[PDB]
Design an enzyme around this catalytic site. Structure first.
Site, PDB file in Angstrom:
ATOM      1  N   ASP A 227      -8.016  -6.969   6.027  1.00 38.11           N
ATOM      2  CA  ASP A 227      -6.918  -7.441   5.195  1.00 38.11           C
ATOM      3  C   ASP A 227      -6.517  -8.879   5.494  1.00 38.11           C
ATOM      4  O   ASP A 227      -5.688  -9.437   4.769  1.00 38.11           O
ATOM      5  CB  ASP A 227      -5.694  -6.537   5.375  1.00 38.11           C
ATOM      6  CG  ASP A 227      -5.820  -5.224   4.633  1.00 38.11           C
ATOM      7  OD1 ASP A 227      -5.620  -5.212   3.402  1.00 38.11           O
ATOM      8  OD2 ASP A 227      -6.106  -4.199   5.284  1.00 38.11           O
TER       9      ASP A 227
ATOM     10  N   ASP B 165       0.834  -1.191   0.000  1.00 41.75           N
ATOM     11  CA  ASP B 165       0.000   0.000   0.000  1.00 41.75           C
ATOM     12  C   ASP B 165       0.877   1.253   0.000  1.00 41.75           C
ATOM     13  O   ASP B 165       2.108   1.187   0.015  1.00 41.75           O
ATOM     14  CB  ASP B 165      -0.948  -0.021   1.196  1.00 41.75           C
ATOM     15  CG  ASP B 165      -0.268  -0.470   2.470  1.00 41.75           C
ATOM     16  OD1 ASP B 165       0.912  -0.866   2.403  1.00 41.75           O
ATOM     17  OD2 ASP B 165      -0.914  -0.430   3.537  1.00 41.75           O
TER      18      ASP B 165
ATOM     19  N   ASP C 258      -2.674  -4.034   7.179  1.00 43.20           N
ATOM     20  CA  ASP C 258      -2.759  -3.614   8.571  1.00 43.20           C
ATOM     21  C   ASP C 258      -4.165  -3.631   9.147  1.00 43.20           C
ATOM     22  O   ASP C 258      -4.300  -3.693  10.375  1.00 43.20           O
ATOM     23  CB  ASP C 258      -2.179  -2.203   8.743  1.00 43.20           C
ATOM     24  CG  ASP C 258      -2.711  -1.226   7.714  1.00 43.20           C
ATOM     25  OD1 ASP C 258      -3.590  -1.617   6.920  1.00 43.20           O
ATOM     26  OD2 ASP C 258      -2.247  -0.066   7.700  1.00 43.20           O
TER      27      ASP C 258
HETATM   28  N1  LIG Z   1     -10.089   9.707   8.697  1.00 50.44           N
HETATM   29  C1  LIG Z   1     -10.410   9.937   7.343  1.00 50.44           C
HETATM   30  N2  LIG Z   1     -11.569  10.597   7.252  1.00 50.44           N
HETATM   31  C2  LIG Z   1     -12.068  10.922   6.026  1.00 50.44           C
HETATM   32  N3  LIG Z   1     -11.396  10.582   4.906  1.00 50.44           N
HETATM   33  C3  LIG Z   1     -10.203   9.903   4.998  1.00 50.44           C
HETATM   34  C4  LIG Z   1      -9.716   9.584   6.193  1.00 50.44           C
HETATM   35  N4  LIG Z   1      -8.551   8.932   6.007  1.00 50.44           N
HETATM   36  C5  LIG Z   1      -8.330   8.855   4.692  1.00 50.44           C
HETATM   37  N5  LIG Z   1      -9.343   9.450   4.061  1.00 50.44           N
HETATM   38  C6  LIG Z   1      -9.494   9.589   2.645  1.00 50.44           C
HETATM   39  O1  LIG Z   1     -10.683   8.622   2.097  1.00 50.44           O
HETATM   40  C7  LIG Z   1     -10.099   7.577   1.605  1.00 50.44           C
HETATM   41  C8  LIG Z   1      -9.876   6.484   2.748  1.00 50.44           C
HETATM   42  O2  LIG Z   1      -9.519   5.273   2.190  1.00 50.44           O
HETATM   43  P1  LIG Z   1      -8.130   4.527   2.818  1.00 50.44           P
HETATM   44  O3  LIG Z   1      -7.958   4.928   4.236  1.00 50.44           O
HETATM   45  O4  LIG Z   1      -8.260   3.070   2.724  1.00 50.44           O
HETATM   46  O5  LIG Z   1      -6.822   5.055   1.930  1.00 50.44           O
HETATM   47  P2  LIG Z   1      -5.386   5.507   2.576  1.00 50.44           P
HETATM   48  O6  LIG Z   1      -5.339   7.030   2.735  1.00 50.44           O
HETATM   49  O7  LIG Z   1      -5.207   4.864   3.928  1.00 50.44           O
HETATM   50  C9  LIG Z   1      -4.054   4.962   1.444  1.00 50.44           C
HETATM   51  P3  LIG Z   1      -3.500   3.243   1.910  1.00 50.44           P
HETATM   52  O8  LIG Z   1      -4.664   2.246   1.703  1.00 50.44           O
HETATM   53  O9  LIG Z   1      -2.380   2.860   1.062  1.00 50.44           O
HETATM   54  O10 LIG Z   1      -3.054   3.213   3.378  1.00 50.44           O
HETATM   55  C10 LIG Z   1      -8.754   8.110   1.068  1.00 50.44           C
HETATM   56  O11 LIG Z   1      -8.927   8.599  -0.201  1.00 50.44           O
HETATM   57  C11 LIG Z   1      -8.391   9.258   2.027  1.00 50.44           C
HETATM   58  O12 LIG Z   1      -7.881  10.429   1.240  1.00 50.44           O
END
Ligand SMILES: Nc1ncnc2c1ncn2[C@@H]1O[C@H](COP(=O)(O)OP(=O)(O)CP(=O)(O)O)[C@@H](O)[C@H]1O
EC number: 7.2.2.13
Lengths: 32, 960, 288
Positions: free
Chosen positions: B658, B313, B654
């Site tokens: 998953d 990720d 994590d």
């Molecule tokens: N606490 C939060 N509240 C609202 N939106 C969030 C958020 N955390 C992340 N987001 C956003 O909404 C989506 C959340 O999806 P997700 O959390 O699975 O992606 P991520 O930011 O963790 C990248 P990765 O999966 O690689 O860790 C993302 O596009 C993020 O920009």
């Protein structure tokens, strides 16, 4: 002078000294 | 046993306050009485039971009894057989114990290397502390994805589902509620069982039982090595029995025949291969864990050297996961946040109430604090508990606003849904600060393009503006501009609940959403730049040169995913995707030929409608793949679809969701500082830090294990020919026996078994990460090339050196090699005391036996001399020693110690009556020097040829 | 053990099998080349007339001529077939000592009929040709009363065991420089002989052991020193070493006799581990 007596217990001393030297060198090398 | 009755009496029984919990002083007072919260381990052996298990146990009690019988038989009148048996059992058992008491000691360290944490609430504060010292009174907090520390009586649940799978074994997640449902403690709802993972939700409970008074308190490589050992032992027993029978036919008094059998059996089998393999795996596991790379099982060490795909990720792994806000966007003006303490630049206007509304939408959704006691610490450097994007928004706002907690206390939220990856929306209902208009605020948070479709209105320079089609295009252009900088943005918006439509007393429901979440307004969005890790581009380059295909399975917008991939190096320079190619050619993307692009970006939404064949072709016809805005179920989809073409795929995860992906993948990589306990326990591998360079370092270690194991096995196998050939010639050519059984033991149980350990500490070669990954199926630890190189090229030269020494001694004492053939009958005859040598002299039996035993001793010494060079040439199998160096001192220590043992066995007085070893003249130590030099030169030339032209015949038929 | 592995459509577990076998043949031929070369280079550094080391051949051992499987001489003096092996072995050994085979032809020579000092014929090299050998007469052993040139132990008495000293190249035995030793012959003289004695093993076996008779050169118990030193097989083919016939006149019938024969001297030494170095033991018994 006579080819019927070999000086053993002198070869043994040298061999044991050589073995002790090698053993000590190895032990010192592991400690370095 | 307390679910039947209410909470007031259970909480007073343990002297607990439901709001606060237990004081710090009482914690140690109850801990020192009750003890730690951990199940009692099974009793441990006294460390001398296994010693006798390996010496006197197994198939060795027969040998011990035989040695005792031979010793007794010698006493009444034989001794050689007893010495041989005692030496065999003692050395084999002691060596097997030394390598078993080391691997066990090393593996004992992994239990406490990573701690188990629980979220207790004591004295009005929640701290993440080790779960061993969980007292039976304190108030604890559990969150989805964690495992409970002890038995819990739920007092305040928030739709938390707890999956037991330990008593019932059913994987169906059972919900948990604070109210009683069954009088049976085994199926009630107040009680949460010990050592059960919490899947979803978050509940608070009071612990009622800890430790023993709880419900629960009442490798392929080894297999291959064992198969090879069994085959070689079968062959050895066949040959030994056949030659034992032949010796009895020749006539050898039934005791020299047993000695011959023991010599053949000991010579033909490697006695310490399996313990060597185990200690190699354990030492490399410790080496891997010293770096931030922890492995649960020993099978993950055997794997991870054949990894061919990494599905990692984006945030946390490929980036530091400490985001500072960079840019904003509102009123069609791309603004950038200046983080200077003195507020320099003045590029943005603060007096506009659009910014105060921006703080009022992005300032109260966050669950962020500063542990209360922070003074003189700048708001920028103040430590925060929570997410990254959360509290990154707070670092943004706190430079403008002047109340970390005062404004958050000014209002209060009535509705709250925890942010989830799949649902993607963060909702909370807040009271308005206006004393005249005390409406109910509504908040949004998530993907900007996923929330933009939920808004038909937008603030502009002060007042709401209707849905504009040009506004969508402006938003898309701003998103592209902010994502092109390798930045992630959060699109959030606020709406006031109508005052008359919704009365100002209505209960805000959580499950059944009654508040309108489909027609809100739009404030803006802001950027949250997360720079990549320092050592990540180098790791991606190392993966690229090593033939490992890196796939990024992220969870945000395709443009920012592509930008961070390009910055890291996942999408290499000069490689373009179909959309960028079409933009370059100004051609519609539909008619663009897909064979001109090798990099692709796959949206998660489109992935739900893709079939197995489409996934297979996407993976096969691209080399640089990213999966943008996907969920962990889709991560399982890629994990399953990527190993359908013979790949050993290692994935990182994590979250709670998953776990199936980690279980399905060959190597499941959890996270040590950001991973939930469910993922941490469902994986075969834990990253002590989330770096993705530690994954590549672990892959390098997994590759190094195979090289070191192959070198050690080849070196151990080389000395089997010179210990079996002398007996072959002793009957085929009828010459005096040039190798005795004690000498064979010294060659095998000495210079072969023990120095082979020293090859496990060899450093990695220069090209360790510059070759394709090994194939777990078509490539084996022991193959025809290794057997050839050991038994036909090096073993033969060693045998020639030993035989040259034997002939030198026999000729210098009188028996020329010409008339040595056919003399075995008279030589070993005790009734012949006038055997005639070449020069005409006549020898008594005990005068020929002394020369024969000196020949045995110098055969041993010559084997040691040639094994010097054999150990030197086995340091590398592709490079050269001159470009490798004598780095490891364990190898040189082994060389010096084996030579010391050889020079001590012969020259020590009194060893010619027990081991039949006699001193040899100094001139005879240099008999095997030419053959050792020949071995070294031949391997140097062969490796030079191998390096010059890869893939040639030499590599095809000699590269073991 | 699959049948679809020997020949599918190309070859037997490999392609043409040619390069690997050619490489192994060349490799093994080369290795034999280095082995033969090194053996020859070793053989260059040794002498042709004397061994490099002779300390391993300690003071030479003493051996009796009737080769007996378990150091026992057990025979019934009634049936001739019982002692056929001993007589046959003695005859085979003594065939080369007959006077019919010792003709000069510039090889043999008329040696002294009394013990004399050692004959040093030159150095142990090749400036001179093949050396001459002193001749030994079979009549020097003889018998007190019996057939002429008889080497058999018939119904009367015991086989006359022939005692010989092992040959060591360039060895000159040194008789002890003293008198009234453990050897008490009628005529005892220190020089030019190597005294030997054949007593019993213990007190229980010295009884009724009879009066042994030594039949050697000069009628004195020893090996005459005129036959030493040995000069090697290459320089002295057909070299006849001295012998010493020992005859036991009267012995106890059907009673095993353990007899130990020694060879006292200054150069001659004795070893506890080696029972045949400078001495030997025999076991004899006659069946009624
Ligand atoms: N606490 C939060 N509240 C609202 N939106 C969030 C958020 N955390 C992340 N987001 C956003 O909404 C989506 C959340 O999806 P997700 O959390 O699975 O992606 P991520 O930011 O963790 C990248 P990765 O999966 O690689 O860790 C993302 O596009 C993020 O920009």
């Amino acid at each position: 002078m006579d080819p019927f007596h070999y000086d053993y217990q002198t070869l043994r001393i040298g061999g044991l000294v050589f073995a002790v030297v090698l053993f000590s060198v190895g032990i010192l090398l592991i400690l370095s | 046993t307390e679910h039947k009755m209410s909470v007031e009496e259970v909480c007073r029984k343990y002297n607990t306050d439901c709001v606060q919990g237990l004081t710090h002083s009482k914690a140690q007072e109850i801990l020192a009485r009750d003890g730690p919260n951990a199940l009692t381990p099974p009793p441990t052996t006294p460390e001398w039971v296994k010693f006798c298990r390996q010496l006197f146990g197994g198939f060795s009690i027969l040998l011990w009894i035989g040695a005792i019988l031979c010793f007794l038989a010698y006493g009444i009148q034989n001794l050689y057989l007893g010495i041989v048996l005692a030496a065999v059992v003692i050395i084999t058992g002691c060596f097997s114990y030394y390598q078993e008491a080391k691997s066990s000691k090393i593996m004992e360290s992994f239990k406490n290397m990573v701690p188990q944490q629980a979220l207790v609430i004591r004295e009005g504060e929640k701290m993440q502390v080790n779960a061993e010292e969980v007292v039976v009174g304190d108030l604890v907090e559990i969150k989805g994805g964690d495992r409970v520390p002890a038995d819990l009586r739920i007092i305040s649940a928030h739709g938390c589902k707890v999956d037991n799978s330990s008593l019932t074994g059913e994987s169906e997640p059972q919900t948990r509620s604070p109210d009683c449902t069954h009088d049976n403690p085994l199926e009630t709802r107040n009680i949460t069982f010990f050592s059960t993972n919490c899947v979803e939700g978050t509940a608070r409970g009071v612990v009622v039982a800890t430790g023993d008074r709880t419900v629960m308190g009442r490798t392929p490589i080894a297999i291959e090595i064992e198969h090879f050992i069994q085959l070689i032992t079968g062959v050895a027993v066949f040959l030994g029995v056949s030659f034992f029978i032949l010796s009895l036919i020749l006539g050898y008094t039934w005791l020299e025949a047993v000695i011959f059998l023991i010599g053949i059996i000991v010579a033909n089998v490697p006695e310490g291969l399996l313990a060597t393999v185990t200690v190699c795996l354990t030492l490399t596991a410790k080496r891997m864990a010293r770096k931030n790379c922890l492995v649960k099982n020993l099978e993950a060490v055997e794997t991870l050297g054949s990894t061919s795909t990494i599905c990692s990720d984006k945030t946390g792994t490929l980036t530091q996961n400490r985001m500072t806000v960079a840019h904003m966007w509102f009123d069609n003006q791309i603004h950038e946040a200046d983080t200077t303490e003195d507020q320099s630049g003045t590029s943005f206007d603060k007096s506009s109430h659009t910014w105060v509304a921006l703080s009022h939408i992005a300032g109260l959704c966050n669950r962020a604090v500063f542990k209360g006691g922070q003074d003189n610490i700048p708001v920028l450097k103040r430590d925060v508990a929570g997410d990254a994007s959360e509290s990154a928004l707070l670092k943004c706002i706190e430079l403008s606003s002047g109340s970390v907690k005062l404004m958050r206390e000014r209002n209060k939220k009535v509705a709250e849904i925890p942010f989830n990856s799949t649902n993607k929306y963060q909702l909370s209902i807040h009271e308005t600060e206006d004393p005249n208009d005390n409406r109910y605020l509504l908040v949004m948070k998530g993907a900007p393009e996923r929330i933009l479709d939920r808004c038909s209105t937008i603030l502009l320079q002060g007042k709401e503006q209707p849905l504009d089609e040009e506004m969508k295009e402006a938003f898309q252009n701003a998103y592209l501009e902010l994502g092109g900088l390798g930045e992630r943005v959060l699109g959030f918006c606020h709406y006031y609940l109508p005052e008359e439509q919704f009365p100002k007393g209505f209960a805000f429901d959580c499950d059944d959403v009654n508040f309108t979440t489909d027609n809100l307004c739009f404030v803006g969005l802001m950027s949250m730049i997360d720079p990549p890790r320092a050592a990540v581009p180098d790791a991606v380059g190392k993966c690229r040169s090593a033939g490992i295909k890196v796939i990024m399975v992220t969870g945000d917008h395709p443009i920012t995913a592509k930008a961070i991939a390009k910055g890291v190096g996942i999408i290499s320079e000069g490689n373009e995707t179909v959309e960028d190619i079409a933009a370059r050619l100004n051609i519609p993307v539909s008619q663009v030929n897909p064979r001109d692009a090798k990099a692709c970006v796959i949206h998660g939404t489109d992935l739900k409608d893709f079939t197995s064949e489409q996934i297979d072709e996407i993976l096969q016809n691209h080399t640089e793949i990213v999966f943008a805005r996907t969920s962990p179920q889709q991560k399982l989809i890629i994990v399953e679809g990527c190993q359908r073409q013979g790949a050993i795929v290692a994935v990182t995860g994590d979250g709670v969701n998953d776990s199936p992906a980690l279980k399905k993948a060959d190597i499941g990589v959890a996270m040590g500082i950001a991973g939930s306990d469910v993922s941490k326990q469902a994986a075969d591998m834990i990253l002590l830090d989330d770096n993705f360079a530690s994954i590549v370092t672990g892959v390098e270690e997994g590759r190094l294990i195979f090289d070191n194991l192959k070198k050690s096995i080849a070196y151990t196998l080389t000395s089997n020919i010179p210990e079996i050939t002398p007996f072959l010639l002793f009957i085929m050519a009828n010459i005096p026996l040039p190798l005795g059984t004690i000498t064979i033991l010294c060659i095998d149980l000495g210079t072969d078994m023990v120095p082979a350990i020293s090859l496990a500490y060899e450093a990695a070669e220069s090209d360790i990460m510059k070759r394709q990954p090994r194939n777990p199926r078509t490539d084996k630890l022991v193959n025809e090339r290794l057997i050839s190189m050991a038994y036909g090229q090096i073993g033969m030269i060693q045998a020639l050196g030993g035989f040259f020494s034997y002939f030198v001694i026999l000729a210098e004492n009188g028996f020329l090699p010409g008339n040595l053939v056919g003399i075995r009958l008279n030589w070993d005859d005790r009734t012949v005391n006038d055997l005639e040598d070449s020069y005409g002299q006549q020898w008594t039996y005990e005068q020929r036996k002394v020369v024969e035993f000196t020949c045995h001793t110098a055969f041993f010494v010559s084997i040691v001399v040639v094994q010097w060079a054999d150990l030197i040439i086995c340091k590398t199998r592709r490079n050269s020693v001159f470009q490798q160096g004598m780095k490891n001192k364990i190898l040189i220590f082994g060389l010096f110690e084996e030579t010391a043992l050889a020079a001590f066995l012969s020259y020590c007085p009194g060893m010619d009556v027990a081991l039949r070893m006699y001193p040899l003249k100094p001139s005879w130590w240099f008999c095997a020097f030419p053959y050792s030099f020949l071995i070294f030169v031949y391997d140097e030339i062969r490796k030079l040829i191998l390096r010059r032209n890869p893939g040639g015949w030499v590599e095809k038929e000699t590269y073991y | 053990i699959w049948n679809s592995e020997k020949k599918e459509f190309l070859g037997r577990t490999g392609g043409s099998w040619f390069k690997i076998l050619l490489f192994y043949v060349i490799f093994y031929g080369c290795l034999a080349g280095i082995f033969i070369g090194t053996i020859q280079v070793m053989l260059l550094t040794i002498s042709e007339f004397k061994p490099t080391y002779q300390d391993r051949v300690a003071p030479p051992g003493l051996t009796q001529i009737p080769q007996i499987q378990k150091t026992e001489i057990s025979f019934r003096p009634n049936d001739p077939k019982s002692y056929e092996a001993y007589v046959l072995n003695i005859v085979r050994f003594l065939e080369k000592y007959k006077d019919s085979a010792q003709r000069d032809d510039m090889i043999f020579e008329d040696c002294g009929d009394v013990p004399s000092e050692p004959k040093e014929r030159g150095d142990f090299n090749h400036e001179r040709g093949e050396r001459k050998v002193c001749r030994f007469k079979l009549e020097w052993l003889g018998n007190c009363s019996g057939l002429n040139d008889e080497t058999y132990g018939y119904k009367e008495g015991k086989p006359c065991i022939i005692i010989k000293l092992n040959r060591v190249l360039g060895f000159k035995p040194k008789p002890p420089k003293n008198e009234s030793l453990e050897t008490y012959p009628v005529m005892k003289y220190n020089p030019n002989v190597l005294p030997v004695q054949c007593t019993g093993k213990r007190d229980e076996d010295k009884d009724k052991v009879g009066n042994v008779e030594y039949f050697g050169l000069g009628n004195s118990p020893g090996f005459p020193l005129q036959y030493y030193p040995y000069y090697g097989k290459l320089l002295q083919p057909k070299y006849l070493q001295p012998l010493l016939a020992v005859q036991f006149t009267n012995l106890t019938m059907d009673t095993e006799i353990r007899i130990e024969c020694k060879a006292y001297g200054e150069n001659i030494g004795y070893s506890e581990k080696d029972r045949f170095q400078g001495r030997f033991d025999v076991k004899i018994e006659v069946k009624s």
